[PDB]
Amino acid sequence: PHKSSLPEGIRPGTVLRIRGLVPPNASRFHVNLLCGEEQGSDAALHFNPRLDTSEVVFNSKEQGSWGREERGPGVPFQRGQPFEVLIIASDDGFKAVVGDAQYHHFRHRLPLARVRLVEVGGDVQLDSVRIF
Amino acid sequence: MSNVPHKSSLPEGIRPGTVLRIRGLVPPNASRFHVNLLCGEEQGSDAALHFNPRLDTSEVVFNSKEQGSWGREERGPGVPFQRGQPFEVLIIASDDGFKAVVGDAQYHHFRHRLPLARVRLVEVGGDVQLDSVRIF
Ligand SMILES: OC[C@H]1O[C@@H](S[C@@H]2O[C@H](CO)[C@H](O)[C@H](n3cc(-c4cccc(F)c4)nn3)[C@H]2O)[C@H](O)[C@@H](n2cc(-c3cccc(F)c3)nn2)[C@H]1O
């Protein structure tokens, strides 16, 4: 599970670029925006491609409890294939970009200013995480 | 074949947290090309951002145009573009300005001079062969 601290926190205009490879046998993987380095910290954003059930789940976690799932059938990832994801913080939410198209817009639940790090876990080969 | 340009409207304008992703090739004998964030489709439209890699003079110029008049030019550090080489540029809008990212590295920050809400059009032209222009 990769972790990268956000160099100047996050505001509208912060961009995370995540390049990686989905393993041939992958079940799921996730990208989290967390509000602290301690285990169980609140997640302002949880981006969760599920290859074994062909869906994507978006959610947040507050006080060890998950929120309302923003989910849907289909997944813009394929086992064995490389990807490039953008997570873009906007004034009213996070835009999740996969490949050449915005896949979802996740409206803010937690205060944007509380986000401290990015976590990448689950079944994924991470090539790079860049923060612009 | 020809240079391949781009024009696309931004009906809802752009807001803080918008990414313009531009991928393309600078052709062998390129002089210069541009990326413009314009306020309308009229010729000579005001420009919130004029981003102008000049291969011929080895500079990258940033400017605005307001009420028909150009602002003071800003110049980035060196030229992260080469004739015969492909590139990727991100133009990222924030509350405070535009960040230009070129090939994996932060390149320049251009503070807003015009209100971001006025932007309604993106045009890419000049000596460039565009792979893709995407706005997120
Ligand atoms: O929200 C995000 C969270 O989701 C749950 S699974 C979730 O749990 C619920 C239980 O009440 C529901 O069963 C829910 N659900 C609704 C439907 C449904 C409802 C209606 C219609 C229809 F079609 C289908 N199907 N399933 C599940 O998605 C994951 O465990 C969790 N997570 C994963 C990890 C994790 C961390 C590290 C490594 C790792 F492998 C996993 N750490 N937290 C996190 O990703």
Residue numbers in the entry:
A (entry chain B): 4 to 135
B (entry chain A): 0 to 135
Describing publication, verbatim:
All the observed CRDs of galectin family adopt a typical β-sandwich fold composed of two antiparallel β-sheets of six strands (S1–S6, S-sheet) and five strands (F1–F5, F-sheet). Concave surface of S-sheet contains conserved amino residues and forms a primary binding groove to which specific glycans up to a length of tetrasaccharide are bound. In this model, the best structurally characterised subsites C and D are responsible for recognition of the β-galactoside-containing disaccharides, whereas the other subsites (A, B and E) remain poorly understood regarding how they contribute to ligand binding interactions.
Galectin-7 contains two arginines (Arg31hGal7 and Arg74hGal7) at the same polypeptide sequence positions as in galectin-3 (Arg144hGal3 and Arg186hGal3). However, TD139 bound to galectin-7 with only a 15-fold increase in affinity compared with TDG binding, in correspondence to a small difference in the binding free energy (ΔΔGTD139-TDG) of −1.7 kcal/mol. Galectin-7 contains Arg31 and His33 at the positions held by Arg144hGal3 and Ala146hGal3, but Arg31hGal7 is displaced in subsite B and thus does not interact with the 4-fluorophenyl substituent of TD139. Likely hindered by the imidazole of His33hGal7, a much bulkier residue than the counterparts Val31hGal1 and Ala146hGal3, the 4-fluorophenyl moiety turns ~50° away as compared to that in the galectin-3 complex, and vacated volume in subsite B of galectin-7 is occupied by two water molecules. Linewidths of all the bound-form resonances were determined as a function of sample temperature to assess the changes in ligand dynamics according to their line broadening effects. These observations are consistent with the resolved X-ray structures and the ITC data of galectins-1 and -3 that both 4-fluorophenyl substituents of TD139 make extensive interactions with residues at both subsites B and E (including π-arginine, van der Waals interactions and fluorine bondings), while in galectin-7 only the 4-fluorophenyl-triazole at subsite E, but not subsite B, forms a π-arginine interaction. By contrast, the interactions between TD139 and the B subsite in the galectins differ such that the number of interactions decrease as: galectin-3 > galectin-1 > galectin-7.
